[PDB]
Each structure stands twice: as C-alpha cells, then as structure tokens.
C-alpha cells in the first residue's frame, strides 16, 4: 500500500459543503452508463471518443462522450471493441454539435458525458463473476462487509467505486438530498504494494462540480479483480 494515506485534516468535510448533496447523490444512485462490446463511432476532441450507447430505460441518452486524460488513451481505444461502465453527468456536458466541414463532429439527439471507464472486451471476460469484498469502517470499527461483483479480469477503479458507493447510498444513507450523516470518508483500493484512495465528499463551498469531481476518473485506472480489496473509512457527522 503506497499513496500517502489521508491525514485526518486532508479530507473534505461534508459539513463544510453547503449546497445540495443531491448533486453528489445522483452520480451514484441507480442510473449509470454500461455497455458491452461497443466501438467508438466519432470523436470530438483529440482526447475523447463518442459512443453510441442507448439509455435502455429512461431514454435520456442516445450517444455518450468518454473523455480521457490524454490523446494516448483516446488513441488506444479508438476503433476497439470495449466494455464501458461509469458515472455520467449532463449539466456541464457538451460535444460535437453536428458533423461539420471543419469540426470532427457527430451526434443527433440526447447527450451525456463521462470520463474513463473503458476496458477491452475481447479476452478480458469471465463466465462467472469474481467477488471483491468491501470492508467499511465507521469511526474505526469494521461494522459491515459486502460483495461487489464483476466478470472482467481487468476492471476500472471507477466501476468498483461506483459499485461500492452505490450500495452505501442505499443501505448507509451515505449521500442524502441536502446532507450526509458522515463527516469524512474515503475509498481505498489495495492490490499489493499498490494502494490509492479517493475522497468521497465534495470540496467546501456552496456548490458542487460534477464534471470536475468525475474528472479524476480520466486516467482510466485499472486494477486486477483477482487482487483488489476495497476499504471505506467513514467518520460520523458529530451526531
Ligand atoms: C450511432 C447512431 O446511430 N447514433 C445516432 C442515434 C441512435 O440511432 C439512437 O440513439 C438510437 O439508439 O440517434 C440518432 O440516430 C438517428 C439518425 O441518424 C436519423 C437520421 O435520419 O435516422 C435514425 O434512424 C431511425 C429512425 O429515426 C427511426 O424512425 C427508425 O424506426 O429506426 C431508425 C434506426 O433506429 C437514426 O436512429 C437520432 O437522430 O436519433 C442520431 C445519432 O447519430
């Protein structure tokens, strides 16, 4: 485990955020992007890829913009059958406008954006999900453990993160409309020597930036499902 742990004063305090926690809840509520064996159909900027992913429930989106850290990543998956899974946003999302004679555009009707969340489909599949155990701690005590599943040998930290946080919002009320019963909290993935963590709470302020928050996912960090272990440490809002 090496990525300097969070020192208690490092983490964001939910109390210090005074603006609709619902904007944070939604990214991890039931909805999300998920498609398997899709290939990019267009591009907007040199660091993104446009996918034809259909919102098979509420019909909210017809196309999806996956944005990356750099051209490399984008190039690595251009015209490659991949699986997609990630938390999407809309409010600050925009792309293409229409296939122009200048701008490399596409997309007719309903858009949504997301960062990373791409893995090769071909040869990264399992018949029989694998189980990653999540050990949540509350003020130091391992007072809960649940299983997250995946049929990918190489799974993105984003998928595991959404999976974990999704369960906590349901069962522990991690994120509520205007609040959170928690003061701090963070998710830590452990592979071997490797370990990194994400901050689950929004930065101080009267508002939250979905786009800027989700952007940390743009490195498309991957991990081995047969090696990870997830741990959440949540401190309680001084009751
Ligand atoms: C990759 C891609 O096709 N992107 C389209 C999407 C998808 O088709 C949509 O998300 C469905 O999953 O939306 C748009 O596609 C339509 C557009 O190209 C128009 C142009 O004339 O043709 C449509 O054909 C439809 C037709 O409208 C229906 O009445 C018919 O019953 O079925 C046809 C195919 O389903 C395209 O679907 C869109 O404008 O809605 C644009 C994106 O480029």
Swiss-Prot record:
Give the top-rank taxon of the lineage listed in the UniProt record for this protein. Answer: Bacteria
PROSITE patterns in the record: STAPH_STREP_TOXIN_1, STAPH_STREP_TOXIN_2
Q: Name one GO cellular component term.
A: extracellular region
Annotated localization: Secreted
Q: Which UniProt keywords apply?
A: Disulfide bond, Enterotoxin, Metal-binding, Secreted, Signal, Superantigen, Toxin, Virulence
The record lists its disulfide bonds as 93-113
The record's listing under SUPFAM superfamilies reads: Bacterial enterotoxins, Superantigen toxins, C-terminal domain
Description of how the protein assembles with itself and partners: Interacts with MHC class II molecules composed of alpha/HLA-DRA and beta/HLA-DRB1 chains. Interacts with T-cell receptor beta variable 19/TRBV19.
Q: What does this protein do?
A: Staphylococcal enterotoxin that activates the host immune system by binding as unprocessed molecules to major histocompatibility (MHC) complex class II and T-cell receptor (TCR) molecules. In turn, this ternary complex activates a large number of T-lymphocytes initiating a systemic release of pro-inflammatory cytokines. Also causes the intoxication staphylococcal food poisoning syndrome.
Something else the entry says is: Lacks the zinc-binding site found in other members of this family, such as staphylococcal enterotoxin A, C2 and D, thus it possesses only one MHC class II binding site.
- Name it: Enterotoxin type B
Origin organism of this chain?
Answer: Staphylococcus aureus
Question: Source organism lineage?
Answer: Bacteria, Bacillati, Bacillota, Bacilli, Bacillales
